[PDB]
Design an enzyme around this catalytic site. Structure first.
Site, PDB file in Angstrom:
ATOM      1  N   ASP A   1      -0.324   4.241  18.024  1.00 61.12           N
ATOM      2  CA  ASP A   1      -1.160   3.070  18.035  1.00 61.12           C
ATOM      3  C   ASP A   1      -0.762   2.013  16.988  1.00 61.12           C
ATOM      4  OD1 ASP A   1      -3.035   1.912  19.736  1.00 61.12           O
ATOM      5  OD2 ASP A   1      -4.783   2.597  18.548  1.00 61.12           O
TER       6      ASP A   1
ATOM      7  N   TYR B   1      -8.327 -12.566  -9.714  1.00 58.40           N
ATOM      8  CA  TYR B   1      -7.583 -13.821  -9.931  1.00 58.40           C
ATOM      9  C   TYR B   1      -8.088 -14.944  -9.019  1.00 58.40           C
ATOM     10  CZ  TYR B   1      -4.185 -10.917 -12.513  1.00 58.40           C
ATOM     11  OH  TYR B   1      -3.601 -10.072 -13.368  1.00 58.40           O
TER      12      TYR B   1
ATOM     13  N   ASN C   1     -14.351  -0.943  -6.004  1.00 58.94           N
ATOM     14  CA  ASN C   1     -15.445  -0.047  -5.705  1.00 58.94           C
ATOM     15  C   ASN C   1     -16.211   0.408  -6.982  1.00 58.94           C
ATOM     16  OD1 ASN C   1     -14.468  -0.094  -2.973  1.00 58.94           O
ATOM     17  ND2 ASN C   1     -12.828   1.204  -3.710  1.00 58.94           N
TER      18      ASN C   1
ATOM     19  N   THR D   1      -6.329 -15.230  -5.114  1.00 56.44           N
ATOM     20  CA  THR D   1      -6.582 -14.228  -4.127  1.00 56.44           C
ATOM     21  C   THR D   1      -7.967 -14.345  -3.441  1.00 56.44           C
ATOM     22  OG1 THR D   1      -7.449 -12.587  -5.769  1.00 56.44           O
ATOM     23  CG2 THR D   1      -5.068 -12.577  -5.243  1.00 56.44           C
TER      24      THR D   1
ATOM     25  N   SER E   1     -11.300  -1.131   0.357  1.00 58.44           N
ATOM     26  CA  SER E   1      -9.980  -1.002   0.968  1.00 58.44           C
ATOM     27  C   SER E   1     -10.014  -1.204   2.490  1.00 58.44           C
ATOM     28  CB  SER E   1      -9.401   0.378   0.734  1.00 58.44           C
ATOM     29  OG  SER E   1      -8.897   0.439  -0.584  1.00 58.44           O
TER      30      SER E   1
ATOM     31  N   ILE F   1      -5.264   3.864  24.220  1.00 60.00           N
ATOM     32  CA  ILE F   1      -5.501   4.940  23.279  1.00 60.00           C
ATOM     33  C   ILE F   1      -6.147   4.418  21.980  1.00 60.00           C
ATOM     34  CG2 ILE F   1      -3.550   6.185  24.241  1.00 60.00           C
ATOM     35  CD1 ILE F   1      -2.000   5.451  21.594  1.00 60.00           C
TER      36      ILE F   1
ATOM     37  N   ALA G   1      -7.897  -8.947  -7.106  1.00 59.08           N
ATOM     38  CA  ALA G   1      -9.009  -9.700  -6.483  1.00 59.08           C
ATOM     39  C   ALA G   1      -9.688 -10.651  -7.494  1.00 59.08           C
ATOM     40  CB  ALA G   1     -10.022  -8.769  -5.870  1.00 59.08           C
TER      41      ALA G   1
ATOM     42  N   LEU H   1      -2.735  -1.234  18.021  1.00 54.55           N
ATOM     43  CA  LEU H   1      -2.281  -1.855  19.257  1.00 54.55           C
ATOM     44  C   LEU H   1      -3.323  -1.889  20.340  1.00 54.55           C
ATOM     45  CD1 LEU H   1       1.351  -0.273  19.127  1.00 54.55           C
ATOM     46  CD2 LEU H   1       0.595  -2.633  18.859  1.00 54.55           C
TER      47      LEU H   1
ATOM     48  N   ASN I   1      -4.202  -1.250  23.955  1.00 60.38           N
ATOM     49  CA  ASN I   1      -3.567  -0.344  24.885  1.00 60.38           C
ATOM     50  C   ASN I   1      -4.595   0.674  25.348  1.00 60.38           C
ATOM     51  OD1 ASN I   1      -1.601   1.400  22.298  1.00 60.38           O
ATOM     52  ND2 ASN I   1      -3.802   1.380  22.729  1.00 60.38           N
TER      53      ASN I   1
ATOM     54  N   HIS J   1      -4.064   6.217   3.217  1.00 66.36           N
ATOM     55  CA  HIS J   1      -4.713   4.961   2.930  1.00 66.36           C
ATOM     56  C   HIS J   1      -3.992   3.767   3.596  1.00 66.36           C
ATOM     57  CE1 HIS J   1      -7.089   2.415   0.028  1.00 66.36           C
ATOM     58  NE2 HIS J   1      -5.992   1.681   0.046  1.00 66.36           N
TER      59      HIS J   1
ATOM     60  N   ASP K   1       0.837  -1.233   0.000  1.00 61.35           N
ATOM     61  CA  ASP K   1       0.000   0.000   0.000  1.00 61.35           C
ATOM     62  C   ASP K   1       0.863   1.271   0.000  1.00 61.35           C
ATOM     63  OD1 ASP K   1      -2.286   1.915   0.811  1.00 61.35           O
ATOM     64  OD2 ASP K   1      -3.335  -0.044   1.040  1.00 61.35           O
TER      65      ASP K   1
ATOM     66  N   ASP L   1     -15.561 -13.245  -2.908  1.00 62.85           N
ATOM     67  CA  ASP L   1     -15.481 -14.431  -2.029  1.00 62.85           C
ATOM     68  C   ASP L   1     -16.152 -14.210  -0.673  1.00 62.85           C
ATOM     69  OD1 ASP L   1     -13.963 -16.331  -3.536  1.00 62.85           O
ATOM     70  OD2 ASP L   1     -12.205 -15.033  -3.239  1.00 62.85           O
TER      71      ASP L   1
END
Length: 275
Positions: free
Chosen positions: A41, A171, A155, A174, A221, A79, A169, A75, A77, A64, A32, A197
């Site tokens: 975080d 194929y 999208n 995947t 995404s 926050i 996607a 994480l 935690n 993104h 990405d 899928d």
């Protein structure tokens, strides 16, 4: 304090967390626009940039890639938010620049890096209406090498009876992932087709943004990282499961939502996939 985005609970990840499975030692490449490694975080363990103009994978000029990574692994935690697999090992594989676009060559180099560096899961919250022979080759290589590859369905919405699933996607190798909202309604922009899928939460998804803040985005995404994390939760409970095995669990234990052309197998349910 920490908030749990709805999507996380929707796919039943907290049930795995309670059982003590949070994705420990599973390596997940976020393929990405980079990841802001300085985000409080997020814990980014490594990476590589294949964007010639952006040598530093640990920064995200787009947002993104950062938002996707937080859905996978923000994480646990005091926050911010919570990832599907908050103990996952996160890798920044920059293949998109700050505009959120990239070249197939750059994408392929990222997936090649992912294979050479023994990632368990690849998230590709990207795609396009056509692929390339070279892209399919390297995606199939990653799959045959044992990697779970989760790709955004696209999208492009619906178009009568025609598939609008983008590549990679589209194929077979995947996992093609579509978007639902908090009521399990397909999002209207979610691409459709026989190649679709599963479904995950893809509407108003709160996650991490660069600069140590949080925000909501919509798209396939955002759906896709729920499935990448889910694959990491599963593997952390079932370290000898093959990518084929994990996929077939995520798919078969999904919560049927309607016509598979629109919903595939339905909403992933990681608690049931991991049983």
């Amino acid at each position: 304090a920490q908030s749990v985005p709805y999507g996380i609970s929707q796919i039943k990840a907290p049930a795995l967390h309670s059982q003590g499975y949070t994705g420990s030692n599973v390596k997940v490449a976020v393929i990405d626009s980079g990841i802001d490694s300085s985000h409080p975080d997020l814990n980014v363990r490594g990476g590589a940039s294949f964007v010639p103009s952006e040598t530093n994978p640990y920064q995200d000029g787009s947002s993104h890639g950062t938002h996707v990574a937080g859905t996978i692994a923000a994480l646990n935690n005091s926050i911010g938010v919570l990832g599907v697999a908050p103990s996952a090992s996160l890798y920044a594989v920059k293949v998109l620049d700050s505009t959120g676009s990239g070249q197939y060559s750059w994408i392929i180099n990222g997936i090649e890096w992912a294979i050479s560096n023994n990632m368990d899961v690849i998230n590709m919250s990207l795609g396009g209406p056509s692929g390339s022979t070279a892209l399919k080759t390297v995606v199939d290589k990653a799959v045959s090498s044992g990697i779970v590859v989760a790709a955004a369905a696209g999208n492009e919405g619906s178009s009568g009876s025609t598939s609008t699933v983008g590549y990679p996607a589209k194929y077979p190798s995947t996992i093609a992932v579509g978007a639902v909202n908090s009521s399990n309604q397909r999002a209207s922009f979610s691409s459709v087709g026989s190649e679709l899928d599963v479904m995950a939460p893809g509407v108003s998804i709160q996650s991490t943004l660069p600069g140590g803040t949080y925000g909501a985005y919509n798209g396939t995404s955002m759906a896709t990282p729920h499935v990448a994390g889910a694959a990491a939760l599963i593997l952390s409970k079932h370290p000898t499961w093959t990518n084929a095995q994990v996929r077939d669990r995520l798919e078969s234990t999904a919560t049927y939502l309607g016509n598979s052309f629109y919903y595939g197998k339905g909403l992933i349910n990681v608690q049931a996939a991991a049983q």
